[PDB]
Write a protein that binds this ligand. Structure first.
Ligand SMILES: O=C(O)c1ccccc1C(=O)O
Ligand code: SF4
Length: 304
């Protein structure tokens, strides 16, 4: 909107002037997606940052993602506008629980979802995303794996791979994606020709009623091969804007309104403040960077 056109102009000039690149997660408000150089998922953004000349990064998302970017770009300054933006699911897994479960099942590799603390990543055998988790677990020798922090994704991986997936912590889940299956019944009657796409973080009954299950990266490729005029989307509300932007010819309908409060902590105002003050810098110990990079590079190595 034109009322913010002077705010946007100061963001563009400062970003240009100080050599920032702005990376925004798909769950950011539309206003921040519209000012970002690249919008996508966590790993997509971090990988993207490795490729660029900009020595400074403004990251718009939540803490474990900004740290991922820093882990993989450690000589680059990474700032976030709100340091309290975090992932409640990720924060429920701890080093202690991982260590507890490694002892119980010492032959099982620890596969950690990218939505995990940096400290947790130092202890994982490999990282995955919702896009590549099935393939990653498939390529591991073992037929029993330890997986966290999301139980639903773990269970999905178990279904797709046929392997035993021991999920940690107990009842690990994303509250944003706990859609109700009756919501799918309801949209099918309302839009009989619509396709339902939901995230694998969604519970089993929702995944099973959906036409497609995939990551937000996967969602945004579906209309390249599906010609449907209407898609119903089971993930965080920010993806609707992303999808509408990429495919203006289609209609994107939320399965339900689902908002990640932590993702919405970032605003045009605090983003502007961040660029004015070049704060808040993501600072990690060298040793955590060194150790946590290992399972992240292995993920890339395995998928290569
Ligand atoms: O990308 C996704 O689908 C996604 C959904 C929820 C949280 C985190 C991510 C992420 O990997 O960035
Ligand atoms: S949508 Fe769920 S998994 Fe993603 S940052 Fe928010 S609470 Fe975490």
């Amino acid at each position: 909107h034109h009322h913010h056109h002077h705010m946007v102009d100061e963001i563009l000039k400062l970003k240009k002037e100080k050599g920032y690149i702005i990376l925004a997660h798909n769950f950011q408000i539309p206003e921040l997606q519209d000012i970002a150089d690249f919008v996508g998922d966590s790993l997509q953004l971090a990988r993207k940052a490795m490729e660029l000349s900009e020595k400074k990064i403004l990251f718009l998302g939540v803490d474990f993602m900004a740290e991922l970017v820093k882990i993989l770009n450690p000589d680059k300054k990474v700032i976030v506008p709100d340091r309290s933006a975090t992932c409640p699911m990720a924060n429920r897994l701890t080093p202690e629980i991982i260590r507890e479960y490694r002892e119980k099942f010492p032959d099982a590799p620890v596969v950690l979802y990218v939505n995990s603390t940096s400290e947790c990543k130092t202890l994982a055998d490999v990282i995955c995303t919702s896009a590549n988790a099935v393939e990653v677990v498939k390529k591991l020798d073992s037929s029993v794996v330890i997986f966290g922090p999301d139980r639903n994704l773990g269970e999905y991986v178990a279904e797709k791979t046929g392997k035993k997936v021991i999920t940690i912590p107990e009842n690990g889940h994303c509250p944003v994606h706990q859609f109700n299956a009756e919501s799918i019944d309801a949209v099918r009657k309302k839009y009989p020709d619509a396709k339902v796409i939901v995230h694998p973080e969604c519970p089993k009954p929702v995944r099973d009623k959906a036409d497609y299950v995939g990551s937000t990266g996967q969602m945004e490729k579906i209309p390249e091969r599906d010609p449907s005029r209407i898609f119903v989307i089971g993930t965080e509300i920010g993806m609707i804007h992303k999808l509408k932007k990429k495919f203006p010819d289609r209609e994107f309908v939320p399965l339900e309104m689902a908002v990640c409060v932590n993702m919405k902590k970032n605003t045009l105002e605090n983003t502007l403040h961040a660029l004015q003050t070049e704060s808040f810098e993501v600072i990690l110990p060298k040793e955590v960077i060194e150790k946590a990079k290992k399972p992240i590079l292995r993920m890339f190595e395995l998928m290569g």
